[PDB]
Design a protein around this nucleic acid. Structure first.
Lengths: 51, 113, 64
RNA sequence: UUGGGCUGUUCGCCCAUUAAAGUGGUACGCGAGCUGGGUUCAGAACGUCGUGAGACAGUUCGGUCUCUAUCUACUGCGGGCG
RNA sequence: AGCAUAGUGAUCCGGUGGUUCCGCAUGGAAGGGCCAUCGCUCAAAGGAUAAAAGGUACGCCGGGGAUAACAGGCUGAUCUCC
RNA sequence: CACGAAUGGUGUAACGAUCUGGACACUGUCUCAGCCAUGAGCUCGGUGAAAUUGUAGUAACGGUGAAGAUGCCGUUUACCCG
RNA sequence: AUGGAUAAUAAUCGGGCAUAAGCAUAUUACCGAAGCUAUGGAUUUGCAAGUUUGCAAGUGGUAGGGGAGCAUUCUAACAGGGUUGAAGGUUUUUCGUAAGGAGGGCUGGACUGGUUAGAAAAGAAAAUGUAGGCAUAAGUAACGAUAAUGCGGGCGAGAAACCCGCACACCGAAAAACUAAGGUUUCCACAGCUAUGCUAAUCAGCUGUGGGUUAGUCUGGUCCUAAGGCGAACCCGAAAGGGA
RNA sequence: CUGUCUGAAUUCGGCGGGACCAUCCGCUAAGGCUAAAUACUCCUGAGAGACCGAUAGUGAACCAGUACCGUGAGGGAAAGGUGAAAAGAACCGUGAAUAACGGAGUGAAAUAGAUCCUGAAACCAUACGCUUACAAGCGGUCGGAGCCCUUUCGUGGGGUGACGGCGUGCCUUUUGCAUAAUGAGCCUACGAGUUAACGCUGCUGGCAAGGAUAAGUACUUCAGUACGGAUCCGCAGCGAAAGCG
RNA sequence: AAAUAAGGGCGUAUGGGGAAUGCCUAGGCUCUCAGAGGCGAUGAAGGACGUGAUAAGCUGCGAAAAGCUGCGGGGACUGGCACACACAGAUUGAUCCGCAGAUAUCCGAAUGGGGCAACCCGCUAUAUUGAAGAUAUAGCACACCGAUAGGUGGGCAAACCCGCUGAACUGAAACAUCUAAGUAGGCGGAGGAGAAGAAAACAAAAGUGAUUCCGUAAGUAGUGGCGAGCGAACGCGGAUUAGCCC
């Protein structure tokens, strides 16, 4: 059957990207929390693009 | 300070497990099965000590009866005539005489009869 | 911290001179016209807290 | 110590035979043996009660029955020893 | 106070009469205190609030064989037989 | 007992993986089961789990017992291992 | 003593069995408990001697109450032990009412600990307790579409599965070709069979080394815009902010 | 202090002294600034612990907010030790093999060989000694031959034990459990009445109609003697209170 | 060679397995004393991509890229974890330490426009065939004020403090007043502290003289479905002491 995760590398960036987190006032607190915890990987935009 | 009873914790159970030597299966090496078997063994050993004193008297009485019925008597009559004669010999010595010294036993019987 | 004294028990239950607790009587509030004058005279003088309630009253007054 | 019609039925009535179509117990025997037709799951409707949410020893349609047998108990077959 | 045993309701709060008892610098007053007394089918009558009814078959959590439905057990009221 | 007129009453051609009763053809649904093929199963070679598990050298009958016994009582039966 | 029906797995004086080994009365001896006594020992209160002894009464025990203590880790003083072998692990002997103490042999190769006083992360057998390791079920289920395999050569130590060849079978509006989404090197060659492949493998989408993607015309940007987003100015809202 | 409305006088004025009024007392609103003694640690330098020692101590002693899980917010591990020094096993043999092993050299040790300090228990096997194929059940206990080792030589010790008697595990909850009521596969490690403030009883100690300091201060060899009487309890109680004692 | 009961039970010895215990520390925990309490448009915190004779990671550093310069200290080794085969530098005084400087790619407040962070695309001045395809350097966001050359602020980040908002579980053995609690949470600003601070104040017939903090006063007065509960002030003893401007 059809599962819940149907990947799309533009629907992913339009919802969880760096420019989508930095646009909101409360979405900008996720970045602060992750930098305070020390996450090596920030928002999904940290995944490398195809080269 | 942090206190851990690690060495004596096992040194205490080694001594209780060393007396479960010869038990069938895991009753000799497994701790929670050996401890449950050593305590029951000690409970069985506390009793049977009151029963060793009344299981040997039965054997003595049977041997005295056997040795007395060889002379046309019974244990009841023999013990009656012995107790009402001023003898005062316990059943252990009487059975030892009836088994090892039949001459002494028949001498006692003829003296009390 | 410091043990707080119960106000309901501190407004009543005056402690006597040596070891007792003095209190008032009840039933003398609003139906006094049909009770005999003997009962109303007996229920007027102050009474003492019984020894069965003394422990609770002392625990409330913070005298353990 | 029978086979059918009616009913989920036990029971019961009826039809045709038979020498006979017994009474009961075994967790109203037996669901790690079978079916789920009835009953007590969630949907919907009728009669009635309750203002209402809802309910009925009232009725009707539909609706997942899990497990590789260790010990003993049975049905069969072998090895060891005496 | 009635020949005697029933005719009853704690506390809080509020009302009335008496009282240089106190009355927040002093003098009064507001108010409080003491005595007498009034207001509760608080009737679930030792009265948890001044103020209070139902459904759950969509239900959920914590426990009970302390407690029912099936089966077992004791006894036959009922049943069957003599 | 306890239908009833827009929480609509009574009929209705066509329609319905709807419910109910009956008829023809047809058949293993059945009387009543029988034969055959492949996969699983069985034996051998390779790899190799899980649920479950207080210790166990783990019988039957009548009875007792927290009222239904592998472990208690009396009797009977049973060579050891698969 | 006799007749007065009995329940469903095979039954009963407990059984054998008994004509007394049944019943009624009387007598004697004996058996019979952790009861009583005889011997040894320990302990609690009360009474005396002292600084333990003697006597009397005791000494089952759940909820619960009281009193004496052991081990563990660390600290303060005095006194110690150890490479001629410390702690730890494994056996053995002995002592105490017990918790426990001390000694010997073997492994082990650097710390340890007596007396008095003190502190506490101060003791597990159960919480369908937690983490790690290891058993049982057991060499059992299973080895993942019933489209199918057979033979001969090659490398090789090793071939039912690898390579080659001849046969057989299956799909064929597909199990064929391109390619979007997506994956992001899995692509190609050579070495390897350790782990991975539900088996072995000389094989591989696995491991290690060397390579591989070439655009004026193909797909996107440099061109345009829809739904929708942002939005100076402007209008609202405790703030963040909302509308546009 | 004000969301809304209303709204005063200027020093013989205005406000406060817990409703309010008169007298006394104090102050002078509708303007502003101001160090010290006080709170904390993303940090910095020095130093301690009757603090932990790898399931402990931070989630993280080690390529840790890592590997893994989710779309995302987010959750979140396990993982220390050879040896003094790599001197980390040249070389030979079996083997297809640089799989493993047996030798040979290093070392004090290779049964310290990289799964490397010592290394227990569960668990899986081999050798030796004694028993076991007519015998029914919490597997033990009390008696008891026979056979193997040791020996101060013994009414001494150790191992196995033919045969007989008795005996229905443990915990919890219950009037009552072998119960067919609950729970546990086993072993190792962790795991549950502790501390602070304020009180009360029992024992002990100092002073005694008196007892004790708190904050703080001074000196010093510094998380460790003197001073400090503010204050608390007791010494007299009764009454709602004035008050009396 | 031996033994043999197919196998099982018990005891001893020797093995595999595993990681407990013992010892140790590379790391942590609670604090004491004295400081400091910020970085950023001269471009922050946090990253991406690069940089080595050899280079997969970590560390350091940015196209001047395991480094450059100046002043002091220091005196034989050095080219980080990192060794090995090497190759070089260095008593003319290297390596290293302290302080002060230079360079400092791209993203990120990101600030020339846009965007799917580490990308794309520009305008004006100059130079390069200059001309199409393109390049090298400089300047190009917004708000305020400065009259004008130009200055100030955007953002990030532990706790303390201030202001604006602000629950419920819980307790009352139920519950609505009450408590929990002006707590948790959300938003904005500043400093090493912040707030407060100089009487339209207390007190009572005697008096004190700004604020803050510590001990008593005191679990007192009082408040409360007068229930649960909440709970001052005066006065006294101390640390410090400071008063001024419209």
């Amino acid at each position: 059957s059809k599962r819940t995760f149907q990947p799309s590398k533009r629907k992913r960036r339009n919802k969880h990207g760096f420019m989508d987190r930095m646009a909101s006032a409360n979405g900008r607190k996720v970045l602060a929390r992750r930098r305070a915890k020390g996450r090596h990987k920030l928002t999904v935009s940290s995944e490398p693009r195809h080269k | 300070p942090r206190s851990v009873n690690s060495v004596a914790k096992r040194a205490r159970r080694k001594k209780i497990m060393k007396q479960a030597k010869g038990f069938f299966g895991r009753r000799k090496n497994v701790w929670t099965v050996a401890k449950n078997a050593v305590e029951k063994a000690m409970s069985y050993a506390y009793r049977d000590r009151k029963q060793n004193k009344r299981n040997f008297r039965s054997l003595w009485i049977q041997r005295i009866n056997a040795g007395a019925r060889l002379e046309g008597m019974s244990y009841s009559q023999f013990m009656g005539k012995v107790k009402a004669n001023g003898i005062e010999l316990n059943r252990k010595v009487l059975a030892d005489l009836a088994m090892n010294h039949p001459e002494a036993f028949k001498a006692i019987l003829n003296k009390v009869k | 911290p410091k043990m707080k004294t119960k106000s309901s028990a501190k407004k009543r239950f005056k402690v006597t001179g040596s070891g007792k607790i003095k209190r008032k009587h009840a039933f003398k509030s609003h139906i006094l016209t049909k009770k005999s004058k003997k009962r109303k005279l007996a229920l007027t003088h102050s009474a003492l807290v019984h020894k069965t309630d003394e422990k609770s009253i002392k625990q409330q007054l913070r005298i353990i």
